[PDB]
Assembly symmetry: D6
């Protein structure tokens, strides 16, 4: 089961959403600034995007 | 008594407000960024929405 | 002496200011985001409003 | 020597600047959000204003 | 292998992106405010830019 | 070697940049909000400006 | 249903546990330092005690 | 698959470890203070215990 | 009504408790480290002591 | 090159040091509480252990 | 009026207290860990010592 | 002028103090936990050691 997208580091949100949804059609894509305090529970259909000032992906997206 | 809305993760605020108010007509819906420091007391009619950069629900809404 | 306004949770700032000033004409109404670090001294004429992303009251206003 | 302005709690920045400069013509008036982390040294000509979301004075201005 | 760009302190993002990509064509350039909490893993193709209020580079860019 | 500019407390960024560059032509001037977490290394050509909500200098600029 | 114990401010943990359990025999009593970051869910049988350096109750215990 | 232990709120670590390991023999039991900043990845064999000053469980243990 | 004890800055807790209770026999004296995050409500019988590493009073005790 | 030790989650520091040094004889093993703010540079011979209250490994050790 | 003691960086608390009290007999000497959040008012008779893990002075003591 | 000691990562404080003082006899050696908030000014004779739970050097000591 695809769980990480190292290939999207540096890409836009638009491009990240497109690639994740090809790979994971049920994905719930959440867009947060880098450094956001996240204590959440594990959601296997959620993919968090941690984004820089220009809304580019700053770290490896992972399911959860 | 309905207390959680896992079905609204990834949805907009507009859609979350609509579904919560169908389920809970007295709901006081509060919209906060993910990571917000919340020490509050329990309010049985309040539903907090924790939202990402695009105002989509990032976690499971719960009464309180 | 009126000290709390549980009835304003979920309401706008405009409506909160209107109701507080009917109840407390000397009120100094201060509008802060939820989660704001507040070490202040007690001011009996001040009412702090802790507001969400849409400027609705997220918690019970109290004098102080 | 005037050191505190409790009378400006709830007032605007414009009004606070006007009153402080009548009382203290050399004042260097600095406008910060409530909750700002301040480790500074003491400056006898500086007056910090701690302001809420609407740029009203949320606490008692003091020299320093 | 080029790993630091002390020459870009004080320069714009545009100029930093241009110089880094001449030196490192595979660079994934990420733009963050100074003071951002970064616990990340090491990515040898990523260059983080820590920027001030005017989007000028405030510290030495480094690979990672 | 000029290292501090107490005379710029309360002044604008424009005026601070002008005075610092007269005094220190190589200066790399960085503009940050008051309260910004700064763990940096010492750069003898850098001058950080810590600015309030109105982009006035809130503390004594120093080299580093 | 008893929900707050203002009478225990300043008292020890031992005394607080004794009084709470007389009033609320099912109580799960949790002892935390003042200032502890608490995002928890509401537990109607739990009573949190926020304690100072000497393990005296520093604020009003409340159910939750 | 057992995922939460609401029955251990208020109990000791010793008792929590005993009950969790009966229910989940592969459990890796980790003991942290309440309020600990946790950005971790999901580990299906790990159970975190969030403990108060007296090493009693302050919140519902959950797998992850 | 006595509300501040500037005379106890630098003194021990023992001495502070003794002087406060002479001045304010109903006082509930709470001992916290400097820098403790305090969002509390106003309690007119409580006196908080903010103490350094050696349990000496580091700031002016005040009622609240 | 071995870079992660998922097998040490839940184990002691003693056991973690032993296994890491078998796998990586040059390892510089650093022992930190979970939640420690780490902005460091990448050191290929360093292995950080993030430990719980009982000095057991709470997360997957990784080189860096 | 003596206001800073750069000569005490690296020295013990005992030695710092001795030198400060020779220079400033009214001094109220307060001993805090480095990194302590200090929003205080200016006290001209107080000297704060910011100390490392071994109770040595880590920064220049200053009046205030 | 020697400014960094990468060779002391993983070593004890005792050993770090010994090596630094051979290299830099005027050194003022300060011992802080990793993650300590440091806004200080530059002191060319000071060497800060950032130490883990076992008082081993966790990062590269540098002058400042």
């Amino acid at each position: 089961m695809k769980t990480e997208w190292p290939e999207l580091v540096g890409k836009s949100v638009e491009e990240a959403k497109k690639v994740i949804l090809q790979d994971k059609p049920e994905a719930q894509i959440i867009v947060l600034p880098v450094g956001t305090i996240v204590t959440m529970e594990y959601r296997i259909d959620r993919v968090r995007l941690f984004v820089d000032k220009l809304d580019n992906i700053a770290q490896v997206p992972r399911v959860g």
